[PDB]
Design an enzyme around this catalytic site. Sequence first.
Site, mmCIF file in Angstrom:
data_model
loop_
_atom_site.group_PDB
_atom_site.id
_atom_site.type_symbol
_atom_site.label_atom_id
_atom_site.label_comp_id
_atom_site.label_asym_id
_atom_site.label_seq_id
_atom_site.Cartn_x
_atom_site.Cartn_y
_atom_site.Cartn_z
ATOM 1 C CG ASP A 114 -10.648 -69.126 29.410
ATOM 2 O OD1 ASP A 114 -11.292 -69.480 28.542
ATOM 3 O OD2 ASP A 114 -9.608 -68.421 29.323
ATOM 4 C CD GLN A 122 -7.659 -83.182 36.777
ATOM 5 O OE1 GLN A 122 -7.445 -84.369 37.046
ATOM 6 N NE2 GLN A 122 -6.506 -82.246 37.237
ATOM 7 C CB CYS A 145 -11.957 -81.377 28.042
ATOM 8 S SG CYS A 145 -11.389 -82.637 29.161
ATOM 9 C CB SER A 146 -7.440 -79.523 27.724
ATOM 10 O OG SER A 146 -7.975 -79.573 28.748
ATOM 11 C CB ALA A 147 -6.125 -83.723 30.059
ATOM 12 N N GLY A 148 -9.220 -84.584 28.636
ATOM 13 C CA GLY A 148 -10.057 -85.930 28.698
ATOM 14 C C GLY A 148 -10.328 -86.310 30.001
ATOM 15 C CB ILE A 149 -9.281 -86.528 33.315
ATOM 16 C CG1 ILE A 149 -8.439 -85.275 33.466
ATOM 17 C CG2 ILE A 149 -8.295 -87.317 32.646
ATOM 18 C CD1 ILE A 149 -6.857 -85.559 33.899
ATOM 19 N N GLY A 150 -11.127 -83.803 33.108
ATOM 20 C CA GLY A 150 -11.678 -82.904 34.031
ATOM 21 C C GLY A 150 -13.084 -82.693 33.512
ATOM 22 N NE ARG A 151 -13.007 -77.035 30.657
ATOM 23 C CZ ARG A 151 -12.779 -76.012 29.812
ATOM 24 N NH1 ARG A 151 -12.909 -76.106 28.565
ATOM 25 N NH2 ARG A 151 -12.137 -74.926 30.174
ATOM 26 C CB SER A 152 -13.773 -85.592 29.545
ATOM 27 O OG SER A 152 -13.515 -85.081 28.153
#
Length: 284
Positions: free
Chosen positions: A181, A262, A215-222
């Site tokens: 999380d 991120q 992922c949520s926004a497609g930049i961090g974990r992506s």
Amino acid sequence: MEMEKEFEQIDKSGSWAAIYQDIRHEASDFPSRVAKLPKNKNRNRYRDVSPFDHSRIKLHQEDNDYINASLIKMEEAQRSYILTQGPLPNTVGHFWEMVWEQKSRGVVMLNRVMEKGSLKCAQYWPQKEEKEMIFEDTNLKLTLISEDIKSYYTVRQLELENLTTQETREILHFHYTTWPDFGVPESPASFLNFLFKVRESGSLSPEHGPVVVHCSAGIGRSGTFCLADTCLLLMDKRKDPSSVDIKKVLLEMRKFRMGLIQTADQLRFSYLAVIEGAKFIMGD
């Protein structure tokens, strides 16, 4: 491995936040006019995560062709990715239209549907074999075929049928389910093993469309996914674990989608995963 001793050097110096800022500053910046049109306001999940117009994916629908998604084309590695946000309730039909039109074989999901008490993504695939999903706006049917739940990821065979041509394809849903999380995983081993399962499935092979990653926004974990896969592949093509500059790769991917990676913990994790994944790619 240079990076292994550059890594040790940056931890010692505690200066991850510094490098990470350097990258934020060098990062490229292009128009995203289509994303910020008001007809598209409700097609975006975050108001400040927009695809660049140049690298954006267009739905084949002359009415509205917008979806928040970028094509990341990595020329030296021969690897393309589609980075996108987690679908909204009103864009789920678009998301599968995109998977259809681009000929993608696999979808990688790096988030859970609910994180931190909130919904980071619509439930865009079916949960029971017998409860199929129909997308009326895009004339698509989606069916769960099989489901293989493991400790830290789930794999799903789905069947995507085009109602208005009666063609079907099989899609692989790779769902990493144990991303913390807050922060990043304590060891990359889980993440690396998930990466290699995706590779082994063939979804990254270039005979197929680009894999859809989100992922949520497609930049961090992506981005962590894409950066690690691409860095590890360039280490192969050169079979030299030190011509690869992970910061230079990152800046090249950010030409194609803003904000990839991120936090500075994500960046550190990126290094950590490439360094470790290099063991099993240099003969092992």
